[PDB]
Design a protein around this ligand. Structure first.
Ligand code: XF1
Ligand code: XF1
Lengths: 306, 305
């Protein structure tokens, strides 16, 4: 029993974190095999930020303008290349701590663990979701660029996020590990703003199923809804459209609880209309949308508390 | 910017988790130096747990009755003994990944990170607090006994919790690493209940300071109060008393924000008496009480390990 924002154990990723310095700019890198990955804005200067020409900035660098430090050991850079918004530094030693890993670009609504790091050293670990507007609501201070997000289903690390920027609203933007930004953002300090964000509907339904699995049914009702009518209502509360894909993805939780997906949709409609009237759901007074269906099956018992 | 419930990096503890099997029972153990630590109820059958005599049960077991697995490697048990509710299994090899560590017993209100483990294999990490009623609101399934809670204080892992039981209400109870239970619980399979819980006042104040650091400040007001008057209000709303020691512990956050503790106390008093509007604080509609003052400092300052 219980239900918390549960991150993956971070040790497999801690063993990959290094410090990268170019000029007076220092941030984090990710050391996998004999390559160190980091944001390309490590090569920018304080004046370079509005409209940097990264190709022109990079050709002026030699391998030895990059200082990479793994703990108290300096790594020797023997090559460098730019891939989209990520810099790839080839080093003379493979990381002996490299886990099994892959790179995956995730969809809005997917969740992942973030290992926040400063000067190549880890500070803390927490769960995040890719918002519908392609930002993440992280906890990052100056020096955190190069921190990564990941999942570790099975024993394989799936790297999905590298942190590049904090936006004026206080949310965060970054890339996959191929250097392609999530969303419309670009790595320069020009005015940019994330779109209006929405609530991840499939995730709220997953979390309501978690509540039922753990023994709570007070919010259910005797009604149902069509998918079309549910989306018509949900849209008025700034919820994302629920698709047939999402209904399919919720199938396992529906099967375990005996609650048809569209019947849980009717419960959500009523919660949006009524509020919680002093009650809570899994400890929250607001509807939670950063647990995916997969996250719920990962954490909850396979046996409903009936 | 931003503020999240944040756990310590778990790598130093991951290297310490092992699987312990006795008879048909498997759970987790903590491997430090040449000793594995786990709950003593590992030696019970289900009927044993109904009313266990642990010293008598342990007498009937030898070293080879304990099967200890570190990953794929089998560890050779060379001794065994109990300390309070914890079994100590001496093994023939010291853990080469043993971090600098110590054993600490925490006070209610203190937070810690939990590394939830199954079959000796870490599966997740999350942040908990020791509740005033000495339970923790964890997230644990069968097989999780022996998972540990910890803080990292500079270079040193301070282990403070080992998981033993889930209570009927779904909260959790465990011991320090010397086997002393937190709370009025015993390791026997029987109906046990925690007392009515209360809210951790100093932690709610720390989180209001975190909200002001992050620019969320609608709840500040012109009023101040006294420690005595505030404690009358805390008692009425089932909040823990606020001591002068708590005021001093909030010192650094009061210094970072410039807002005196008794100033903030008048804000919290008005929130307790009137609620929020339809308003939130740091995204929450409830007053959060599982961030300590030091938790707020370390997250907002970027302290590393
Ligand atoms: C769109 C508005 C912001 O546009 C940009 C554009 C670019 Cl190219 C980079 C940054 C950025 C740089 C830097 C930075 C700078 C110098 C040395 C080191 C670093 C680092 N570490 C930090 N942080 C930051 C701060 C706080 C929380 N998280 C990220 C940035 O957002 C910001
Ligand atoms: C107060 C009512 C419960 O009284 C007890 C007393 C004692 Cl001595 C132990 C337990 C207990 C045992 C066991 C257990 C048993 C056999 C083999 C392995 C394990 C394990 N792992 C699991 N879990 C448990 C389950 C879910 C979440 N977290 C903990 C217990 O609470 C429960």
């Amino acid at each position: 029993s219980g239900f918390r924002k549960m991150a993956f154990p971070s040790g497999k990723v801690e063993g990959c974190m290094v410090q990268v310095t170019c000029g007076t700019t220092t941030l984090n890198g990710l050391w996998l095999d004999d390559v160190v990955y980091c944001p390309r804005h490590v090569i920018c200067t304080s004046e370079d930020m509005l409209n940097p020409n990264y190709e022109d900035l990079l050709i002026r660098k030699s391998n030895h303008n990059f200082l990479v430090q793994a703990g108290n050991v300096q790594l020797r850079v023997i090559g460098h290349s730019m891939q989209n918004c990520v810099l790839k530094l080839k080093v003379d030693t493979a990381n002996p701590k490299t886990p099994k890993y892959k790179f995956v670009r995730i969809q809005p609504g997917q969740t992942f663990s973030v290992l926040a790091c400063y000067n190549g050293s880890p500070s803390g670990v927490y769960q995040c979701a890719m918002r519908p507007n392609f930002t993440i609501k992280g906890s990052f201070l100056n020096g955190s660029c190069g921190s990564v997000g990941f999942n570790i289903d099975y024993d394989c690390v799936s790297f999905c996020y590298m942190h590049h920027m904090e936006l004026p609203t206080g949310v965060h933007a970054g890339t996959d590990l191929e250097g392609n930004f999530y969303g419309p953002f670009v790595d320069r300090q020009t005015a940019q703003a994330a779109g209006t964000d929405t609530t991840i509907t499939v995730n709220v339904l997953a979390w309501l199923y978690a509540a039922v699995i753990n023994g709570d049914r007070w919010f259910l009702n005797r009604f149902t809804t069509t998918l079309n009518d549910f989306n018509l209502v949900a849209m008025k509360y700034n919820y994302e459209p629920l698709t047939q894909d999402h209904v399919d993805i919720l199938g396992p939780l529906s099967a375990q609880t005996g609650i048809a997906v569209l019947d849980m949709c009717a419960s959500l409609k009523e919660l949006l209309q009524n509020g919680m009237n002093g009650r809570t759901i899994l400890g929250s007074a607001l509807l939670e949308d950063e647990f995916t269906p997969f996250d719920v099956v990962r954490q909850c018992s396979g046996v409903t508390f009936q």
